[PDB]
Design a protein around this ligand. Structure first.
Ligand SMILES: NC(=O)c1ccc[n+]([C@@H]2O[C@H](COP(=O)([O-])OP(=O)(O)OC[C@H]3O[C@@H](n4cnc5c(N)ncnc54)[C@H](OP(=O)(O)O)[C@@H]3O)[C@@H](O)[C@H]2O)c1
Ligand SMILES: O=C(O)Cn1ccc(=O)n(Cc2nc3cc(Cl)ccc3s2)c1=O
Length: 315
């Protein structure tokens, strides 16, 4: 089945295209190729500073009659320097303008942390610590709720929230919309069993990011583990005459997750979508879950002092 039901009654494609680190010089072609081979879900963010080039591609394929807007599922995220309630609408509208759209299918609070407002996406002090803003999760959520009530987004959710931060929102007095999705890092070295268990039990769909372990992450160190190069996983893939990446994409799919692998290479974009023609066995799944090391690609330690830093909690 290719789509999962959200709590807003809409259906979200379980396989989408990641765009973090896709250069503007290449992401337009990436998206065009993706849509041509079947992707309908694109994961975006204002902080990725390529939304205009993503919008170029969508506009194009709409104009070529390859797809209709209704068939697309476009995701973006509210960046940390816009968590003040008076800044959320503007941030959302900038993303809409850049993507040349009239609505987003899903809009996420990108991180639970608010940062000092300003042009700087990661404001630091003279010391190198990120400068927080005096905003909180609940007020920011209320602001996200207005975007639904105004017709700008069909659904709202969160990203990189721990189960206690998700809880705050759920128990929010006067809650208007429950979160639809929590997008979190998830892959065989960070299997997220507990948080997935919590979210799915609350009827919140989980999206797995960095499913290939983000080898292009700019802070990679050579000693870091490498999922795509893991011989144990290469062996699972060779058993199914599939590539390591296809295995890494198919894994979260069989855990009822959404997954959003990133590529700007047309061959790999196609390859990565060809994961609906095979099944990981029960042993394969068990084996892959067993590689958990609680290893995070995305956890900027310059944020570990923010009151809302998400990863001090077990989950
Ligand atoms: N919510 C947030 O905080 C958050 C954080 C991180 C990521 N995300 C989202 O999740 C998406 C995916 O995560 P990610 O970008 O960190 O990394 P990823 O998808 O785990 O890995 C992308 C890397 O894998 C390479 N690659 C892709 N397909 C491959 C294949 N078949 N064989 C070999 N290498 C392949 C890509 O190369 P090329 O592109 O050069 O082909 C790129 O270097 C993002 O782009 C973003 O949309 C969200
Ligand atoms: O955010 C994106 O989708 C991609 N991305 C880009 C740059 C980067 O450093 N990170 C790591 C971060 N860690 C935290 C940790 C916290 Cl608490 C807040 C924000 C971030 S950003 C990152 O994930």
């Amino acid at each position: 089945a290719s789509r999962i039901l959200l709590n807003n009654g809409a259906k979200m494609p379980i396989l989408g295209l990641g765009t973090w680190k896709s250069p503007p010089g290449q992401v337009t072609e990436a998206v065009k190729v993706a849509i041509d081979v079947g992707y309908r879900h694109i994961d975006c963010a204002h902080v990725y500073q390529n939304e205009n080039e993503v919008g170029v591609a969508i506009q194009e394929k709409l104009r070529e009659q390859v797809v209709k807007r209704e068939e697309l599922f476009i995701v973006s995220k509210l960046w940390c320097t816009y968590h003040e309630k008076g800044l959320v609408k503007g941030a959302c509208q900038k993303t809409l303008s850049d993507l040349k759209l009239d609505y987003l299918d899903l809009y996420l609070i990108h991180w639970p942390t608010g940062f000092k407002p300003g042009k700087e996406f990661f404001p630091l002090d003279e010391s190198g610590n990120v400068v927080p803003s005096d905003t909180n999760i609940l007020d920011t959520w209320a602001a996200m709720e207005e975007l639904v009530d105004e017709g700008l987004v069909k659904a709202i959710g969160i990203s990189n929230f721990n189960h206690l931060q998700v809880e705050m929102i759920l128990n929010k007095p006067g809650l208007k919309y429950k979160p639809a999705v929590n997008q979190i890092e998830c892959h065989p070295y960070l299997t997220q069993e507990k948080l997935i268990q919590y979210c799915q039990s609350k009827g919140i769909v989980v999206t797995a990011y960095s499913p290939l372990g983000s080898p292009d992450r700019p802070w990679a160190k050579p000693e870091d583990p490498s999922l795509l190069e893991d011989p144990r996983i290469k062996a699972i893939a060779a058993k199914h005459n599939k590539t390591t990446a296809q295995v890494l994409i198919r894994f979260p799919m069989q855990r009822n997750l959404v997954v959003i692998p990133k590529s700007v290479t047309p061959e790999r974009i196609a390859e990565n979508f060809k994961v609906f023609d095979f099944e990981l066995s029960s042993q394969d799944m068990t084996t892959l879950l067993s590689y958990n090391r609680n290893w995070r690609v995305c956890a900027l330690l310059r944020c570990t002092s923010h009151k809302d830093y998400p990863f001090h909690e077990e989950f």
